[PDB]
Design a protein around this ligand. Structure first.
Ligand SMILES: *Cc1ccc(C(=O)NCC2CCOCC2)cc1
Ligand SMILES: *Cc1ccc(C(=O)NCC2CCOCC2)cc1
Ligand SMILES: [Cl-]
Ligand SMILES: [Cl-]
Lengths: 227, 9, 227, 9
């Protein structure tokens, strides 16, 4: 997207979101990142929403095909699962490439740095979901390390009700439960996150209260499923 | 187990 | 898909449908058609379902963007609508190319020939939905001609409850109402189709009765909207 | 005005 203006790429990403054209959205936001300027709060959300939708569809397809494949155990089901898996890995690698070149190194404010590091943890988590061979352990540790650095910053620099801090803790708890085989750590993190947010709600406006309690309900839903 | 949906801007 | 076996392409199209990967589905079915053999009843359905889903998403996106564009009347909204429009036209052209090379000319049985001609009418109708300039009239006449030839065969060779005959009449009535500015023809066709099917239901098994009455309800829904 | 949905095999 080298010949399109940055502002036009951002405008078209918003249009693609309205049209539910998430592959286009992701390509426009990739082009915007590659302009080399830092991203605003809204622009970071557009980047994240675009790729979450793209990889979300790939993950859902991979799970369907992996399930069919396990029930069978010709080459077609494995071959097609492999094709989807490779395409998913390519999207995760693309996002991780954008974070590494050069979103994270230029992110100095807590809100941007925690956001990008949460993203890094998430896309390594998606790689871990399909990983088997020599690198599954290294991929898991890469997810854990990104999430941990984001946690450390968010606990130092953000209030316990901050939605980015809450969504980070939510996803790190899912990482513990689903990827790291640490359900007790998952439950403990979700509980402590919920309780510390509840005690901070009194400081918030009506709109901020709505933002934070929405994500706290997601923590509660997981705890209900896990206990 | 739900992660952040994160599908809507 | 020249190096993949026809049977593997068909198997992977079915897997793609289960995974809701309709672009893949369409590419696999395009490869199966290009093997040069006629398609079975099930294979025709796979081809149709794949491309209906692909173009269905494109049409929905185009309508969102066209609506935004009309509310505005920079170049971005028009440019992006044009991009989606061009991609939609390319998919319609691809389907019409498959029908012309060489599905229709090899289709001798009523069930296959009516099916392909209905498809031809549908994809010209989708082209007509976005057409404006010198060829909108020719595109509309191409849709009408395909639908008309399919109608003539279906009335001669199929019972009034045949689901292909009913779905053809349903879509031709939508063509009359939405494209040809002939709402009275649309209503008359839907009414006569419904009434002649109702009088033939007594001949059907329980399962065929369910298939036909489902499509008759779609005719009824349109009549309720149109009257 | 609905055409045949035709989205499911
Ligand atoms: C990583 C992350 C953190 C927080 C959010 C967020 O606030 N999302 C808003 C969602 C929709 C409406 O309410 C619940 C969540 C997204 C991503
Ligand atoms: C062109 C055409 C004709 C008929 C059909 C059909 O039978 N579709 C089955 C649908 C799903 C279940 O019941 C209602 C319609 C498709 C396409
Ligand atoms: Cl494949
Ligand atoms: Cl564009």
């Amino acid at each position: 997207m080298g010949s399109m203006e940055r502002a036009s790429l951002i405008q078209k990403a918003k249009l693609a979101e309205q049209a539910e054209r998430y592959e286009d959205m992701a390509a426009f936001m990739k082009g915007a990142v590659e302009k080399g300027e830092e991203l605003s709060c809204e622009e970071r959300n557009l980047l994240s929403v675009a790729y979450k939708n793209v990889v979300g569809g790939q993950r859902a397809a991979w799970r369907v095909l992996s399930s069919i494949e396990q029930k069978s155990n010709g080459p077609e089901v494995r071959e097609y699962r492999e094709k989807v898996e490779t395409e998913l890995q390519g999207v995760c690698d693309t996002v991780l490439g954008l974070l590494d070149s050069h979103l994270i190194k230029e992110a100095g404010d807590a809100e941007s740095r925690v956001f990008y590091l949460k993203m890094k943890g998430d896309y390594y988590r998606y790689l871990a979901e399909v990983a088997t061979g020599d690198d599954k352990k290294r991929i898991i540790d890469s997810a854990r390390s990104a999430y941990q650095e984001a946690m450390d910053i968010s606990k130092k620099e953000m209030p316990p009700t901050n939605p980015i801090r809450l969504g980070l803790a939510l996803n790190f708890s899912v990482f513990h439960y689903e990827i790291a085989n640490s359900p007790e750590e998952a439950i403990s993190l979700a509980k402590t996150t919920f309780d510390e947010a509840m005690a901070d709600l009194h400081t918030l406006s009506e709109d901020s209260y709505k933002d934070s309690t929405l994500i706290m309900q997601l923590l509660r839903d997981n705890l209900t499923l896990w206990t | 187990a739900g992660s952040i949906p994160g599908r809507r801007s």
